[PDB]
Design a protein around this ligand. Structure first.
Ligand SMILES: *[C@@H]1O[C@H](CO)[C@@H](O)[C@H](O)[C@H]1NC(C)=O
Ligand SMILES: *[C@@H]1O[C@H](CO)[C@@H](O)[C@H](O)[C@H]1NC(C)=O
Ligand SMILES: *[C@@H]1O[C@H](CO)[C@@H](O)[C@H](O)[C@H]1NC(C)=O
Lengths: 101, 437, 437
């Protein structure tokens, strides 16, 4: 029979009813490496922890992709005028920074 | 002095209220509810029990005939049968071959013990909470009976308390209920005067001593078998006796929040819902002058151990410099942690230790001495015992503190990502502004 | 056969219901409300009455000293006065000239007749309608006491009636009411244990025979005059007697819809608000086979004299061709006119005359005999008397009938304007199409 944190009660025969409760026991380390903390919280709240971790991972990937795209666009804007000029004498120093062929 | 707090409606939780009044040293008032009652108002619809069929001796008329006569009894039936020959015993009982008639009658009454064994159909309206609270502050320690509305006002050592209305309108009872010996059923009984045979309320009565007795039992007489004196009949068996098997599960067995449904005054003892607003009006003599209390300086808090179990599984120690020996009142200004004590002895040797209870991996709360404030941070560890026979001594607040172990990692990762993003923004903005003109 | 109607909650209004069952002649069932009661459910808060101050004989200790002890009596005062010289009578009563103390004492008790006159403070919840209806059809003439909720079922001569819940939840009582002898006040009394001196509720008690007696009467005990034995004190006069002077106007004097607030069971009788849904279950013995019913042919309705007064101011005659004598049943299929009779008498060669009641200048309604039908129109003049001692026998339907005198003028004028408008429409369309060529 299930015993949540809310409690539980059983009645057996002509005896008085008995009430039991559940403590917040789990597996993992609350203060350990990040996977151990994730495992601890998944031990307490599985679905909520999965949702939170997935949301944070998506947000981190979004931020990384946006930043990389912005550097790519900045490099494009800084280097593309030289690709139009017929002479096309790009400074070697600016080629070093922006990886100019 | 007027003060208002909100205490949770859970039996046994030690609640502590802190009163800070300018000119005086702070007062901690502890006050907990020891039991609760919740009585609905009941309108008795009717009373039902098992019935009793009354069957008198038949009337036989040798060489004659009879006539049926209506009567005022409940479910009354009467019939006359045309040609009989009873053969009473040691004889025929009539000297009359074919012109004999029998008068058969029967009706329904109430059981001879209906005043001991019966069920009551009720209608339940708005209930009234009625608690019992123990108040402790200073050197008073007393428990009082109150009504949990805004009306009842009580006094405890010169202080006046009003325990305001419960914030929840929940009730375990339905509109219609049925109450047998000691149990209550959320049942939907028939209307009065429209009961049906063989089911609950096949006979009805407004009260125990009433004298109406509606009865629908499908009573029906039959012709006597030829050659003997008897009055056969058929009738659906009792509906009270049917209900005493097929009734179902009582509200006693299935009640939310651990309500304990109880006896003659129908009540739901010790449900755990809502909050209890309370307002107090303390006298002027219940406080202590600041010039008469110890002065605490350089208060510091260090946590010795930390286990976020149901009981007081944490110990903290406070170091301070004082000026005189006296009493100070301790309080926790967050509900993540629950102190066990309401006051402490302060001595020249500046050490004092307190036990607290929490459910968080990394609690963080402000504790106060008589005139001192300090912050306590900790790293609790989960317990090993799966099941305990008591309820938690804390409010189940789990979210970890900012700058804990788990959230420091989030802070550092977010800082790295944000630094990268702002570096990208600065690069792009500078490039675009330079290249624009 | 099951039929369901809606009747108004008006005492004395003659209501008539029409039942048209196929294969049987129509039956008109008439039933009217005789009485009405609306009883709230009351929770007693406390009891208040006049108080009584108990002042025992003073205790004078010659050549000594005394000390005062607190007691538990309500509003209890005790004081010691240090230097006295009482001079009892024909003497001084003491020998020492300045070492003599008097012990003064007084407290408050509930009145001697508090069970014979007092005021009860209540809380009023959902009220229960309970009417007394007279039903009449065929040969039955009975009035039944019934509960106006969907539950109670009652049989009048074989037909089962259920009078459903009222359509409105209006009540004349407030949440808090005070009940003196025969009069009810919508008054907001103080909480229990927080009554103030000189006002209603300066002493409180949960029950008449209870033994708590909260008292706040501002009792205060003064120093005796030199050389004289007496206990002088001051105190605010009773708040119950003050309330009896300044209690306001009772609910009896002002109450909407003509309610008559009544005695010990607090009820509001004969209010006129809402409608009562009714459901009946008629047997077959109530109706009449359509064969027996006379066959009515060529029914015509013409109104001789009509005035739209409160009583039955209209008269109409029906001309018809029949085949045989009998008793039909008349009905009006619009509440713009209310008929006085339920059943008629159809004769071999004749007419039938009936009285009706209306509030409209030009009523139009459909009247039926056994199974025939007709349409009635009339012109009614206003009455002459300004004031009558009785209520209207009709529903206040004043809007006239189309094709009446007042509306036919609008018909003709609007028709002329519409003819002009359509002529102009046609002229413009013809012009704009001819020019289109
Ligand atoms: C006696 O018997 C005859 C027929 O045997 C019957 O008609 C009559 O009623 C009887 N009388 C009495 C007093 O039983
Ligand atoms: C208050 O009094 C009750 C009465 O027995 C006692 O059980 C309880 O321990 C007391 N509280 C304190 C703090 O002494
Ligand atoms: C019977 O009904 C008539 C109406 O037809 C009414 O006047 C009379 O009062 C009723 N009988 C009694 C006893 O009330």
């Amino acid at each position: 029979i299930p015993v949540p944190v809310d409690g539980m009660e059983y009645h057996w025969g002509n005896n008085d009813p008995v009430r039991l409760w559940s403590q917040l026991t789990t597996e993992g380390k609350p203060h350990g490496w990040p996977h151990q903390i994730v495992q601890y919280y998944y031990g307490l709240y599985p679905a909520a922890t999965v949702s939170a971790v997935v949301g944070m991972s998506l947000l981190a990937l979004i931020s990384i992709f946006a930043s990389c795209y912005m550097l790519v666009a900045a490099r494009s804007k800084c280097l593309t005028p030289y690709a139009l000029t017929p002479g096309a004498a790009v400074p070697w120093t600016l080629g070093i920074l922006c990886c100019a062929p | 002095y007027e003060h208002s707090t909100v205490m949770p409606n859970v039996v046994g939780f030690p609640y502590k209220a802190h009163i800070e009044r300018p000119g005086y040293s702070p007062l901690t008032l502890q006050m907990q509810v020891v039991e609760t009652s919740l009585e609905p108002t009941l309108n008795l619809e009717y009373i039902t029990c098992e019935y009793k069929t009354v069957v008198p001796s038949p009337y036989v008329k040798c060489c004659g005939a009879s006539e049926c006569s209506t009567k005022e009894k409940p479910d009354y039936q009467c019939k006359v049968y045309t040609g009989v020959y009873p053969f009473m015993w040691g004889g025929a009982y009539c000297f009359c071959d074919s012109e004999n008639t029998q008068l058969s009658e029967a009706y329904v009454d109430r059981s001879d013990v209906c005043r001991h064994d019966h069920a009551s159909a009720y209608k339940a309206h708005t209930a009234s909470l009625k608690a019992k609270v123990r108040v402790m502050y200073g050197n008073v320690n007393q428990t009082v009976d109150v009504y949990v509305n805004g009306d009842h006002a009580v006094t405890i050592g010169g202080t006046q308390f009003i325990f305001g209305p419960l914030s929840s309108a929940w009730t375990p009872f339905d509109n219609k209920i049925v109450v047998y010996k000691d149990e209550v059923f959320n049942q939907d009984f028939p209307p009065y005067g429209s009961g049906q045979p063989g089911r609950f309320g096949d006979i009805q009565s407004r009260t125990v001593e009433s004298n109406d007795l509606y009865a629908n039992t499908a009573l029906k007489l039959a012709r006597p078998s030829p050659g003997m004196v008897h009055v056969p009949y058929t009738q659906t068996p009792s509906g009270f006796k049917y209900w005493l098997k097929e009734k179902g599960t009582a509200l006693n067995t299935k009640a939310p929040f651990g309500c304990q449904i109880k006896t003659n005054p129908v009540r739901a003892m010790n449900c755990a819902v809502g909050n209890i607003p309370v307002s107090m009006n303390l006298p002027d003599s219940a406080f202590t002058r600041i010039v008469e209390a110890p002065t605490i300086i350089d208060l510091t808090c260090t946590v010795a151990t930390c286990t976020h179990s149901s009981d007081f599984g944490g110990v903290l120690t406070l170091t301070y410099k004082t000026d005189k020996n006296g009493d100070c009142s301790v309080h926790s200004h967050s509900n993540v942690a629950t102190l066990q004590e309401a006051t402490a002895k302060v001595k020249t040797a500046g050490k004092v230790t307190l036990h607290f209870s929490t459910a968080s991996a990394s609690p963080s709360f402000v504790v106060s001495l008589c005139s001192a404030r300090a912050t306590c941070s900790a790293s609790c560890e989960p317990p090993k015992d799966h099941i305990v026979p008591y309820a938690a001594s804390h409010s189940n607040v789990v979210f970890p503190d900012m700058s804990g172990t788990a959230l420091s990692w989030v802070q550092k990762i977010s800082g790295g990502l944000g630094a990268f993003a702002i570096g990208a923004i600065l690069v792009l903005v500078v490039v675009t502004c330079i290249g624009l003109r």
